[PDB]
Amino acid sequence: VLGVLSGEFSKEREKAKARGDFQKLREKQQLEEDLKGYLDWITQAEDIDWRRWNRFCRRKCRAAVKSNVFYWLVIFLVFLNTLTIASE
Amino acid sequence: ESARREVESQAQQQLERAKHKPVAFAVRTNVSYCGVLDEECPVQGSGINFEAKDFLHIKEKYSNDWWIGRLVKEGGDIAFIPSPQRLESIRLKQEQKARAEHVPPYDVVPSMRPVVLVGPSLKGYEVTDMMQKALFDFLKHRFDGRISITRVTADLSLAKRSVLNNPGKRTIIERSSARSSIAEVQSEIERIFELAKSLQLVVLDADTINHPAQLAKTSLAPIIVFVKVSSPKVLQRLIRSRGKSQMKHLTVQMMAYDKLVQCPPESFDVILDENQLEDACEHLAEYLEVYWRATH
Amino acid sequence: CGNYILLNVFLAIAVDNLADAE
Amino acid sequence: FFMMNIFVGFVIVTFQEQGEQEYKNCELDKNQRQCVEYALKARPLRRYI
Amino acid sequence: LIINLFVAVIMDNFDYLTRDWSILGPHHLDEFKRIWAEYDPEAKGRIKHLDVVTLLRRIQPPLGFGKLCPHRVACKRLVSMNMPLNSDGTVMFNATLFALVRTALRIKTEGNLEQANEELRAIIKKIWKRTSMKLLDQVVPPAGD
Ligand SMILES: COCC(CCO[C@H]1CC[C@@]2(C)C(=CC[C@H]3[C@@H]4C[C@@H]5O[C@]6(CC[C@@H](C)CO6)[C@@H](C)[C@@H]5[C@@]4(C)CC[C@@H]32)C1)COC
């Protein structure tokens, strides 16, 4: 087992840190995070300014869902429903 | 030698009588000199060292040979400062000790530096317009009461050359694809100066400025706020997701972004490269409050 | 030659553990 | 898998138990430091015949 | 507990088995040091320069510059490592090992007081604690100090 360990370690680090595919995956996930953040920024920018009432309600709908109390209530309801369906 | 003590006492009395008086002029100096050890001032030890690219507030005139100034830094204290004629005498002494520009330290600048936002792409396009609109709304709403917003339509990049009635370049000013008849530029400059004279922090929405280097030789010397996207790929995806109309203008936006990237960091004053809107907003607000306290 | 391969599969699991260590 | 993942967690735990004992190098190099500290203590012998 | 003992033994052997044993592992250098202790049957202590060329010509294939004995880079290995001439070309085993380290390391010829002196004086404090057994500071000055 120790010999197989050494054989695997001889390649898990060498020739792997060179191309840095782990760094590539980290860059991909960082890019996804930055994209979602900037898209949220753009949505905020377009929302900050028939249709006027709809735009006004858009701000309140976007703000309400982000509240932690709403998230706690939703997760509690989901857990209760899952227990109910698992009450069998 | 009681005359020196008498004049020192008189100067100290005048200072203490006018320590709290308003500011006469705003000064932006690009020359380095140490005045702390200068005993030539009437009140020895009360000199202020003015260095390159420093901002000062001139309060009043002691005489033609000495004036009164304060530093715009936080908790600044008013003291003596060489007068314009005294600055001329000091530079004469400096060139006497050693062996052109003749730029006075008291360069005519607004009361405090205006704030202008640049990046991450060409202004007037959808992405940059929304990104700067969000920040403008945040700045207006949070710091309402002592913050002013100013919009300028005409170009402001011409303030030193082609504005001196230079025969070579003042000819091509009407057919440069811009509303530039010099007179409106001067009117807007005077408008900026008079708005600054109110001693209320102001910002400029320069629809023409898209690069720091085109607003450097000007006498405004504004505050540059840089907001940038981490990756060009992210910017491209944002442009594609924004709509089907900016596809024709994607290349110019990318060109502007990559040109702005190459700008040295020292040219910019602050950097806002935080993905979250709140983080960048607070980062800008802290600097704004620090600057506001510095002049107050 | 079977079990070693399974152990190599376990080594692959170790590689999976490597995939779980990366 | 998951127990193995728990074991993988144990792996990380072992990586915390023994793999975090690398401390600070505090020498000129990382491998050449080992060579220097290994080749400076070596002493010649005689091997009498 | 057997898993713990396995982890202990593999960590103990990590600096032995999972090392650079591919080509130029430090344990290969240790084996060549043992060879040096064995490859010189004369064991005269002060091996002449005309005697090292006869037998010590083959120093080390991996660590050595090449198969151009006595020195592949004659200029570098006889100037940067000064030609040992303590007694008709006397060569010290410790001095030769230090020369091989210099081949592995990177310090220039005489005039390297900065890096070489830092290495040879930080011995006392922070590189290789040798406050005692100062005999090296009596055999290196012929070569390095
Ligand atoms: C200087 O080198 C160390 C350094 C720091 C990181 O340490 C790593 C070293 C190897 C080590 C300890 C690590 C992760 C998986 C570990 C393996 C999981 C497997 O679990 C077992 C246990 C028995 C079986 C039940 C399943 O297989 C072992 C065969 C296998 C194992 C214990 C062998 C050793 C491995 C961490 C850099 O290394 C990347």
Contacts of D among chains (3+ CB pairs under 8 A): C, E
Beta strand B147-152 pairing with B201-206: parallel
The tokens of B210 are what?
């898209």
Question: B268 vs chain A: nearest CA distance in angstroms?
Answer: 22
Question: Chain A partners of C15 at a C-beta cutoff of 8 Å?
Answer: 8, 12
- Which of B82, B108, B134 corresponds to the end of one domain? B108
Cα(D11) to centroid of ligand 1, in Å? 6
**Ramachandran area for residue D47 (φ above 0: left; ψ -120 to 50: alpha; else beta):** left
Could you tell me if B149 and B277 lie in one domain?
Answer: yes
Resolution of the determined structure in angstroms stands at 3.4
Verify whether the Cβ–Cβ distance B133 to A42 is below 8 Å: no
Could you tell me if B196 and B101 lie in one domain?
Answer: no
Question: E80 vs chain D: nearest CA distance in angstroms?
Answer: 18
Read off the DSSP letter of residue E16: T
Could you tell me if B182 and B288 lie in one domain?
Answer: yes
Experimental method: cryo-EM
Nearest CA-CA partner of B7 in B48, B89, B63, B52: B63
Spatial distance between the Cα atoms of E63 and E61, rounded to a whole number of angstroms: 6
Could you tell me if B162 and B226 lie in one domain?
Answer: yes
Atom number, ligand 1, closest to the C-alpha of residue E10: 34
Could you tell me if B35 and B179 lie in one domain?
Answer: no
Helix%, strand%, coil% for chain B, nearest 5? 40, 20, 40
CATH number at residue B257: 3.40.50.300
Q: Is E13 exposed, middle or buried (0-12, 13-18, 19+ CB in 10 A)?
A: middle
- Which of B58, B80, B108 corresponds to the end of one domain? B108
C15 to chain A, any CB pair closer than 8 A? The answer is yes
Verify whether the Cβ–Cβ distance B230 to A46 is below 8 Å: no
Task: Answer for the pair B288, B143: CB distance below 8 angstroms, yes or no.
Answer: yes
> What is the sign, positive or negative, of the torsion defined by CA atoms of B206, B209, B211, B215?
negative
Could you tell me if B92 and B147 lie in one domain?
Answer: no
Spatial distance between the Cα atoms of B108 and B267, rounded to a whole number of angstroms: 21
Spatial distance between the Cα atoms of B99 and B101, rounded to a whole number of angstroms: 15
Q: Is B200 exposed, middle or buried (0-12, 13-18, 19+ CB in 10 A)?
A: middle
Return the bridge partners of B223, or none: B115
Could you tell me if B147 and B279 lie in one domain?
Answer: yes
The tokens of A63 are what?
């703000």
Residue D34: Cβ within 10 Å count? 15
Q: 3-state class of B270 per DSSP?
A: strand
Question: Chain B partners of A49 at a C-beta cutoff of 8 Å?
Answer: 133, 137
Q: 3-state class of E113 per DSSP?
A: helix
Q: Is C17 in the pocket of ligand 1 (CB under 6 A)?
A: yes
Q: Which residues have C-beta within 8 Å of that of residue B213, sequence separation ≥ 6?
A: B263, B267
> Nearest 5°: CA angle at B242, between A59 and B119?
95
CATH number at residue B11: 2.30.30.40
Query: E31-40 contacts: CB < 8 A, separation 24 or more?
Result: E32/E60, E32/E62, E32/E63, E33/D39, E33/D42, E33/E97, E36/E93, E36/E96, E36/E97, E37/D44, E37/D45, E37/D47, E37/E93, E38/D47, E40/E93
- Domain hosting B8: range is 2-108
Annotate B154-195 with DSSP letters as a single string. Answer: S--S-SSSSSS--TTTSSTTSSSSS---SHHHHHHHHHHHHH
CA distances in angstroms from B171 to B174, B184, B218, B237, E3, listed in the order given: 8, 16, 20, 43, 87
Could you tell me if B124 and B86 lie in one domain?
Answer: no
Alpha-carbon dihedral B148, B151, B152, B157, rounded to 10 degrees? 70
Q: How many residues does chain A have?
A: 88
Q: Is E10 in the pocket of ligand 1 (CB under 6 A)?
A: yes
Could you tell me if B128 and B97 lie in one domain?
Answer: no
Could you tell me if B14 and B76 lie in one domain?
Answer: yes
Kind and range of the H or E element at D38? Answer: helix D32-39
Task: Answer for the pair B275, A37: CB distance below 8 angstroms, yes or no.
Answer: yes
- Which of B79, B108, B137 corresponds to the end of one domain? B108
Ligand 1 pocket mutation pick from D14, D16, D22, D25 by most atoms within 8 angstroms of CB: D14
Atom number, ligand 1, closest to the C-alpha of residue E11: 12
Number of folded domains in chain B?
A: 2
> What is the sign, positive or negative, of the torsion defined by CA atoms of C12, C13, C15, C16?
positive
Nearest CA-CA partner of B103 in B27, B186, B178: B27
What stretches of chain B show up as alpha helix (H) in DSSP? Answer: 2-17, 84-97, 126-142, 183-197, 232-242, 250-261, 277-294
Could you tell me if B72 and B144 lie in one domain?
Answer: no
Could you tell me if B151 and B92 lie in one domain?
Answer: no
Amino acid (1-letter code) at residue D13: V
Protein residue whose Cα sits closest to atom 15 of ligand 1 = D11
Q: Is B234 exposed, middle or buried (0-12, 13-18, 19+ CB in 10 A)?
A: buried
Nearest CA-CA partner of B130 in B220, B212, B227: B227
Helix%, strand%, coil% for chain E, nearest 5? 40, 0, 55
